[PDB]
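Good morning,

Attaching, inline, the backbone tokens for the sequence recovery test we're adding to the shared suite. The designed sequence is right after.
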């Protein structure tokens, strides 16, 4: 053609300066969600450029593969964070999920969660990678009746693979846990109108002629 003439261009992927464009049977680039060869492509309404990474449409999160612009489903690790997506709709999950019978938990931000959280069953632990002999980072485990310490705070389990929150003294040492935080209290605590003091490094109630400062 002459330079700048809008020529006919149909049914092929156009790559221009690293971007991606798709044209219909006519000579116009397409916008919005598009299906070619069952791949679930997406294009911007004001640029017609395919997506690169995480792209929230209105409220649902998404992931698109860089250098190919095809959507990806399943466990996708982007920017040093773990994500999981749907198979039918490819939406990142929010909340505790029953996928594969392992009770994965997610936040409103779709990064994976590590620690103990208040679930529907109660307070169930979620473990990092390579703690259990075959575990996914963020998968609930069969941890039973052992003391666990993550970033200073401590709490104790039971035989039902759950986190307890009562007083429940063990070997004449009381380990009070919070009713919602489910962590052991440290320092001064005025519970039920009475005074109890637990230690800093450990979390038992000191008894006897115990002197503070």
């Amino acid at each position: 053609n002459i330079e700048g003439q809008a020529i006919v261009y149909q049914s092929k992927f156009l790559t221009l300066n690293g971007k991606k464009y798709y044209f219909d049977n006519d000579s116009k680039a397409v916008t919005g969600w598009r299906i070619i060869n069952n791949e679930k492509y997406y294009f911007n309404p004001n640029n017609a450029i395919a997506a690169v990474g995480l792209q929230v449409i209105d409220n649902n999160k998404y992931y698109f593969n860089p250098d190919t612009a095809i959507i990806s489903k399943g466990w996708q690790t982007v920017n040093g964070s773990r994500y999981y997506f749907d198979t039918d709709t490819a939406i990142a999950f929010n909340g505790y999920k029953t996928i594969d019978g392992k009770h994965f938990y997610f936040d409103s931000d779709c990064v994976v969660k590590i620690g103990v959280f208040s679930t529907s069953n109660g307070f169930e632990y979620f473990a990092p990678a390579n703690t259990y002999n075959n575990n996914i980072e963020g998968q609930a485990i069969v941890y039973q009746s052992k003391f666990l310490t993550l970033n200073g705070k401590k709490y104790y389990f039971d035989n039902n693979s759950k986190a307890v929150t009562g007083l429940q003294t063990i070997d004449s040492k009381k380990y009070y846990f919070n009713t919602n935080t489910a962590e052991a209290a440290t320092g001064w605590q005025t519970i039920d109108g009475k005074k109890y003091y637990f230690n800093t490094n450990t979390a038992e109630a000191a008894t006897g002629w115990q002197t503070i400062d």
